Subunit: 120 residues, 6 copies
Amino acid sequence: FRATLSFAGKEFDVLDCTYSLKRDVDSKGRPSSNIYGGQIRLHVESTDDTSILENMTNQFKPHSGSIVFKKGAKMKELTWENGYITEFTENIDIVQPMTITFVVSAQVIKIGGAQFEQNW
Amino acid sequence: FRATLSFAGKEFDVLDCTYSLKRDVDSRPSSNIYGGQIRLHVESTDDTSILENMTNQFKPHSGSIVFKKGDAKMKELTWENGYITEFTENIDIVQPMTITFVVSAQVIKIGGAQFEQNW
Amino acid sequence: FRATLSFAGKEFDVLDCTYSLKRDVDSKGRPSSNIYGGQIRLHVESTDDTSILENMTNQFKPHSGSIVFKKGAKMKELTWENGYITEFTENIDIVQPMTITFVVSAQVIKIGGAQFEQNW
Amino acid sequence: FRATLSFAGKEFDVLDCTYSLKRDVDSRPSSNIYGGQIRLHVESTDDTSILENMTNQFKPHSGSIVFKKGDAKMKELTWENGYITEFTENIDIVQPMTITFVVSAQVIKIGGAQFEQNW
Amino acid sequence: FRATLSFAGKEFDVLDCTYSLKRDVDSKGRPSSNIYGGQIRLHVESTDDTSILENMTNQFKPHSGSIVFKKGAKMKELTWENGYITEFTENIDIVQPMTITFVVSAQVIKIGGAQFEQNW
Amino acid sequence: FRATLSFAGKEFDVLDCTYSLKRDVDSRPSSNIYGGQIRLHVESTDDTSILENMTNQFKPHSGSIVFKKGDAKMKELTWENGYITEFTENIDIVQPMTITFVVSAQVIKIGGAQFEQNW
């Protein structure tokens, strides 16, 4: 209903967010792999600010971030730790007019009681 | 009309559910039946049970989907000995917040039908 | 306009049905193969009934079926003989709410004066 | 506006028709012309003539499509020495019942143009 | 706004026209090729006339053509020289009812001050 | 709201613009950053400057896109040492006439960010 990313000491209004995890399955349909993925894909409005891009281009240190989902009270909160921005796009279209879509790849993601942690 | 998933001691309203099975053919059926993955689409709440069930434990589980019309129980898809093998959650201010996940199970059953994998 | 499948001693209202046949063509565009395909793809409403699925999962014997197409009088009739259900999907979507799509692979299909018969 | 296929001693109303031809190019045209398959889309009736013509016999045939406007004959695509190499019939209560089929022919002709395959 | 193809001593009203050119780029994103493409794709109404097709099927000699773009005065003009029709489709659909789409591959294309010329 | 490209000593109204960058990952980021191509979509006029800049010369160039809201300058994407590596112009009586082209540049800059290729 409302989603607020805390990132790089700033807040951004989230238009849309998705994260996904997967395990392989063999022929007999038995799970045949550990869990992989956990990339977070975020979509936020553009302003004069270039902090997200700077965070990808201008430095090399891992970061943390926080998305808080609300209704109308904090419903739940997706956080990541030790991540890097691995995909960035900014788009203007004079017809949501100006926006950024970027993906974080992080060693740890957490939300409510769940934790996913990569093999690094 | 209405579908109710019973999973992990909780109930979830099903926005959409699909399960499928297939056999190969040659140039004549040429294989045993495979697939039987169940794909479920449910609303998100404060709950993280589905994901916890994927990430936080390793033990197979059972689940139950009950399909209804107007008011009784029309039929019921159950699985046994399954694992969540695909999860995605999406938020979009434009159904606002939802989970789509896939169960891979050794046994699925509905009405009089039973499908059971070679394990 | 109205299509009625007779299958497994029951009748089902057909939402949609398609069957297809094909022959290869070489470079010069000459037909370069016998006719293959003839799979029938059927789409019917779900009820409490699980006969179609049972017919795929619970037994192994070939079957016959019959689709009668009407207008408003029997217009024509697609029949198959010695077939097997090789693909099944059932879908519920609380937005046609609940339906089955399945494919029959059969040694013989017939409609009006046409007959197609596989090499088995 | 209106298209009428004459085939197998019968007439069929054409919902849609396309034919195409092409030549390859290199990094300059680099091939003779190929294709010339005709793709036809017509209403289904009690008739099974088109399918019978594919399944039940083996002899090449001719056909004729006449394109009209308002009332005469605008132009006419004809084929000679062809075979039906693809057939699909579809019923859908939502054009309700139709056939889509492809003719592969040695010769197609329309207005002053002629295309003829290397056979 | 209005586009008029002059071709084979006739004029045709252009429903739509597109041409495109491209150069490869390496990993470092440096251009890594000369310019290629320059095929023109044209879309015109069908009449009783079969001149375009005849030009593809019935002869083998290169040709020239001219598209004039207007507003409401000639805005600019795409011309080609030494070209061949390498793709033709005609479509009727009783739902633009009857039309031709064809592609010209030409050694030289020119528009305003630009010229592109293939290696033949 | 409004975007103005300054290129080849002229200005063009931007219908749409996108630029993107990415890094590969392994089974963890596993590459330096690549991409940074800018994709621009502008109206056609009597002008052929963009195409001339691709076809008629061979020297790298710079350009400037200024993004605005309501009235000042919100931010500005600039490139340096670039080449037009993809051009398409389309006319369609149904935006009627437009150009879509891609710039590949050694350096792009916007607000405080800078991206620079390994050349």
